[PDB]
Amino acid sequence: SAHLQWMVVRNCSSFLIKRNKQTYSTEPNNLKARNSFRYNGLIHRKTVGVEPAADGKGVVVVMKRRSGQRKPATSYVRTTINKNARATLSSIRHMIRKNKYRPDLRMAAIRRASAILRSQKP
Amino acid sequence: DIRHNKDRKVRRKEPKSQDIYLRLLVKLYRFLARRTNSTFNQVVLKRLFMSRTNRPPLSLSR
Amino acid sequence: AALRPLVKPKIVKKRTKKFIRHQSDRYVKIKRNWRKPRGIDNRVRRRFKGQILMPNIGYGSNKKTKHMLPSGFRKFLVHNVKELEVLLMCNKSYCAEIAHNVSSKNRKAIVERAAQLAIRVTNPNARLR
Amino acid sequence: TVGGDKNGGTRVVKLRKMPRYYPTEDVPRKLLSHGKKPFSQHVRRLRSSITPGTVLIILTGRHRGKRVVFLKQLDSGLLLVTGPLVINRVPLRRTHQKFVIATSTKVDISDVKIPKHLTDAYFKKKQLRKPRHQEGEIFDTEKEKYEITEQRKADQKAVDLQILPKIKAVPQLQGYLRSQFSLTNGMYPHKLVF
Amino acid sequence: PETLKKKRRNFAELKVKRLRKKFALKTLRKARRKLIYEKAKHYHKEYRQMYRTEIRMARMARKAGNFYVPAEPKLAFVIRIRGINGVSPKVRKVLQLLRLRQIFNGTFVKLNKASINMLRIVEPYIAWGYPNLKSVNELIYKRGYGKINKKRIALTDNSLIARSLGKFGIICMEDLIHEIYTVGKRFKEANNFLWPFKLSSPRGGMKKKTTHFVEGGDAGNREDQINRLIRRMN
RNA sequence: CGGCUACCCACCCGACCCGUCUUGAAACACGGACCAAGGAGUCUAACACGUGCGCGAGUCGGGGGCUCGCACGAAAGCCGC
RNA sequence: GAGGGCGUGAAACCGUUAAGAGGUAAACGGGUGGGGUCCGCGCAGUCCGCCCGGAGGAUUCAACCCGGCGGCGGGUCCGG
Ligand SMILES: [Mg+2]
Ligand SMILES: [Mg+2]
Ligand SMILES: [Mg+2]
Ligand SMILES: [Mg+2]
Ligand SMILES: [Mg+2]
Ligand SMILES: [Mg+2]
Ligand SMILES: [Mg+2]
Ligand SMILES: [Mg+2]
Ligand SMILES: [Mg+2]
Ligand SMILES: [Mg+2]
Ligand SMILES: [Mg+2]
Ligand SMILES: [Mg+2]
Ligand SMILES: [Mg+2]
Ligand SMILES: [Mg+2]
Ligand SMILES: [Mg+2]
């Protein structure tokens, strides 16, 4: 039930900021900032997300387990990748190309990972 | 030139109701009537935009 | 060494002047804001020559360059650091603008986060001593 | 590509590896237009009044209306002219076709015997600087202006010693080229015959 | 896998399936090219013969001291001359039926007993004449616009004509020009397919626009002099 | 060095003072010295049409009663012979 | 710069200081030019990121295997 939930979340929902002519969805598990159906990370059975590590280096990747639904305690598996600028970029690409696992938004995840690595470099 | 009093088609192209299930039905039947090239799909998509009056309740004996 | 945006075209404006309300110069009670003149024998309503101009849909700027700053970015208003990381993916076309009611203690943190994220800020180095 | 190693056999090497950084929202590609050539592949045009051995007036140059002799057309589309340094102090100079006025006078120059080493690449402006930041000296280059010799004077002395025997044959050409063109009050160019 | 190795050959088989189709399409396109070339050649020969026979008949008649009169031209080009506001409905209806709504536009009309009177009704607002072959050629090439649908699509490729009007045999623009200049059984469709030719203002300047051409103006019958005006309007 | 603009000045062209009654308003027709605040199509009952919702030859508890005393409860929940 | 109808302190109006202008009342729209405040840059000296071929140094991993956990996919729907 992805479209049924999107017809409720597309408006009248929290996390949404549209003060200017552009709107932003701002979910804890989301790659881009656009409030769209193909990029929402709360309504699908399979979701990929990247995030800067809490220690100060590396990238954490959150994947929707899909094994047990409606159980947000273990619904997300979190891994940590701390490698050079290319090994992480290749591992994240394999994580979406080898498995089917939502083949789209692969470029979105890769771009976000590269952008957060650019900020982790200094 | 030509008068512009009848240039705008008054027919509706979007359901005024906010029912989510009706919206999903419209989103599905629009794709069907656009792709399958079926006049039945076209007419059943057109009949979903209609209001409460234009969709009369058909009885069982009829 | 300002932050280079993405490709930007030469923005052209159809009208560079702001529309002035009719007879707003003679009386100071009449604000500069434009109001549609609805007189039965007014010159501006029937568009006599030599009078002031009325704003219509024709003066609409190009949609490709609408809401674009002269630097080449499009501004987005922020309040804290949480609403700054949302512009991470759109740093090449969109830029940040800190609100006016943000204190100087919490403003420098936003500036440092934007500098780390390589996000253009329209009002940098503001309210410094 | 497969190269030997120290331990563990040999490992394959992948040339042109994947990039490490991706800029977001990259610019799309063009529409692949046609009929557009670079400057090096353009066809060069010349006016019928500009023939080898013609006098030209340098209007927009730094000489501001000097009479020079035209030698030949280069490959980039610019005219290679020269005035006798004894007559008028102008070296072998590059000029533009549309920026000169051609006088109907002609000089027998067919036996010019122009060298082949000088070309469009021979006439360039090179600027270099030692420091990257700002300093008192002006780049250490423009302070002492260019004074390259033994190559700018060699070809000049090779060409003028051949051009002068052809100019001095005309009864009053060395003075005509010495003079500088100017517009007085009595004549207008639309009626003047050049 | 072996199934993937067989799918490798199936990919080449589908490539050959597309290649044979595109090769047949290219051969058919070359055949249609040759066909339209031959049709244009035949039309040029027909134009030569029809232009020479007009002088042939006159020369063979003048030898016996007897005058020869040609046939009345069956095609007439009409241009709108006057403006929009300030027109009677009796003539505005005819202007709307002649597809002449805005000023300075022209269309071809098949001359008949009804069309002659229709033009006479709106004579003060139109300038009509007998177009020439080169004028028709220019009006179809430069200002040629057809409507495959309710939109005005520019005439650039012969496929645009062959798709909408090819069911009668007018596949090419030369066929269109021939059907226009040699009005026959399929002239109405070819004329209605063409959008009203939006013409520019003349160069030499129109003399006494409100006066008839006979009195010294321009709004009237310009049988042979309308080409000199078309040359400046287009 | 670049800068449109809500800064000032000058030239060229066009430019009569706004609102409503009127076929006709800049009028020798009426109101306005200027500025700040307030200021005018609301609400109830009934009717007609159209739209959204729920049920459907049925529909409606707005009138009362029931559970526990309740800041939110002058709410909400229920009646089923 | 809260001094006994004293929080904040607008407009009409008036005084002073600075700038500019002045015979067709002032004002106004279209287009330029001049002056001034201010803004951004430091002005013959400043564009970014990717790949490769070279010039020097330091590091563990990546190829591959092993231990091993976490998730993906379907075959038997196997014990349920
Ligand atoms: Mg209208
Ligand atoms: Mg109507
Ligand atoms: Mg009126
Ligand atoms: Mg002219
Ligand atoms: Mg009023
Ligand atoms: Mg009255
Ligand atoms: Mg009266
Ligand atoms: Mg009035
Ligand atoms: Mg009055
Ligand atoms: Mg009176
Ligand atoms: Mg009064
Ligand atoms: Mg008020
Ligand atoms: Mg105080
Ligand atoms: Mg006080
Ligand atoms: Mg003064």
Computed over its alpha carbons, how large is the radius of gyration of chain C?
21
Where is A59: in which H helix or E strand?
strand A59-64
D129 sits within 7 Å of strand G by its CB: yes
* Cβ pair A23, A17 in contact under 8 A: yes
d(CA D117, CA D123): 11
For the record, the structure tokens of A106 come out as 């692969």
The SS3 call for residue A77 is: strand
CB C80 within 8 A of CB C103: no
Contact D156, D84 (CB under 8 A): no
CB-CB neighbors (< 8 A) of A7 in chain B: 20, 23-24
Residue D45 and residue A89: Cα distance in Å, rounded? 54
Of A22, A31, A116, the CB nearest to C76: A22
Give contacts of B24 with chain A, Cβ < 8 Å.
3-4, 7
Contact across the interface for D20 and A86, Cβ inside 8 Å: yes
Picking from C6, C89, C91, the nearest residue to D27 by CB comes out as C6
Q: Which of D67, D77, D164, D56 is nearest to D119 (CA)?
A: D77
Rounded to whole angstroms, the Cα distance separating C114 from C83 reads 11
Q: What is the maximum alpha-carbon separation in chain C?
A: 61
Report the amino acid identity of residue E81.
Answer: I
If you measure CA to CA, which chain A residue comes closest to B20? A7
Strand G near-CB residues (< 7 Å), A 18-57: none
Instruction: Please report, for residues D51, E129, E133, the alpha-carbon distance to residue E47 in angstroms, rounded to integers and kept in the order given.
Output: 49, 20, 9
Check if D34 contacts A (Cβ < 8 Å).
no
If you measure CA to C1', which residue is closest to nucleotide F5?
C17
Sign of CA dihedral B32, B36, B42, B43: negative
Geometric angle at alpha carbon B25, from B23 and B26, rounded to 5°:
65
Distance C36 CA to ligand 12 centre (A): 19
Judge contact between D106 and D53, C-beta under 8 A.
yes
Torsion sign across C-alpha atoms B20, B22, B23, B28: positive
Chains C/A: 3 or more C-beta pairs closer than 8 A? yes
Say how many Å lie between the CA of residue D137 and the centre of ligand 14.
62
Token pair in block for residue E134 = 């080169």
Question: What size, in residues, is chain C?
Answer: 129
Resolution in angstrom units: 3.1
Chain B residues touching residue A4 (CB < 8 angstroms): 20, 24
> Helices E158-165 and E173-181 sit at what angle, rounded to 10 degrees?
60
Flag whether A touches B (3+ CB pairs, 8 A cutoff): yes
> CB distance from C81 to chain D under 8 Å?
no
What pairing do the DSSP bridges indicate for beta strands C74-78 and C94-98? parallel
Dump strand ranges (E) for E100-232: 105-110, 126-129, 145-146, 153-154, 197-198
Rg (C-alpha) for chain E, rounded Å, is 24
Q: Do C21 and C33 touch, CB atoms closer than 8 A?
A: yes
Give residue C41 CA to ligand 10 midpoint distance, Å.
21
Q: Tell me which amino acid residue A71 is.
A: K
CB C38 within 8 A of CB C59: no
Measure the CA–CA gap between D33 and D36, rounded to whole angstroms: 7
- Class of residue B36 by CB neighbours under 10 A (exposed 0-12, middle 13-18, buried 19+): exposed
Centre of ligand 7 to C-alpha C41, Å, is 17
Chain A CB contacts of D17 under 8 Å are 86
The Cα C64–Cα C87 span in angstroms is 20
A116 interface with C at CB cutoff 8 Å: yes
Cβ atoms C120, C99 nearer than 8 A:
no
DSSP state for residue E73 in the 8-state scheme: P
D21 touches chain C (CB under 8 A): no
Own/partner long-range contacts of D127-131 (Cβ < 8 Å, ≥24 apart): none
Q: D79: which 2 tokens?
A: 């005219």
DSSP β-ladder status, A76-81 and D100-106:
unpaired
CB within 8 Å: C89 and A115: yes
**A76-81 vs A59-64, strand pairing mode:** antiparallel
Closest nt to residue C44, judged CA to C1': G29
The CA distance from A89 to the nearest CA of chain D, in Å, is: 7
Rounded distance from Cα C30 to ligand 11 centre (Å): 21
Q: How far is CA E211 from CA B34, C118, D73, in A?
A: 56, 74, 61
Q: Give Cβ neighbours of residue B55 (< 8 Å, ≥ 6 apart).
A: B47
B28 in A contact zone (CB under 8 Å): no
CB-based contact, C99 to chain A, within 8 Å? no
Give the Cβ contact number of residue E125 at 10 Å.
20
In degrees and rounded to multiples of 5, residue D72 shows phi and psi of -165, 165
DSSP letters of chain C?
-PPP-S-------S--SPP--TTTTT-TTS-SS------SS-HHHHT-TTSPPPP-GGGPPPTTSTT--TTS-EEEEE-SSTTTGGGGTTTTTEEEEE-TT--HHHHHHHHHHHHHHT--BSS-S-S--
Query: What is the distance between the alpha carbons of residues D20 and A11, in angstroms, rounded to a whole number?
Result: 38
**Distance in angstroms, CA of C34 to C1' of G40?**
32
E106: amino acid identity, one letter:
G
Contacts of E among chains (3+ CB pairs under 8 A): B
Task: Quote the DSSP letter at residue E120.
Answer: H
Amino acid at C129: R
> What are C60's two structure tokens?
């609409």
Contact at CB, A89 and D18, closer than 8 angstroms: yes
Cβ-contact B22, B47 below 8 angstroms: no
Q: How far is the CA of C29 from the centre of ligand 9 (A)?
A: 22
| Calpha distance D179→D68 (Å, rounded) | 11
Question: Which phi-psi region, left, alpha or beta, contains residue D15 (left: φ > 0; alpha: ψ -120 to 50)?
Answer: beta
The residues of E whose Cβ lies within 8 A of any Cβ of B are 84, 101-102
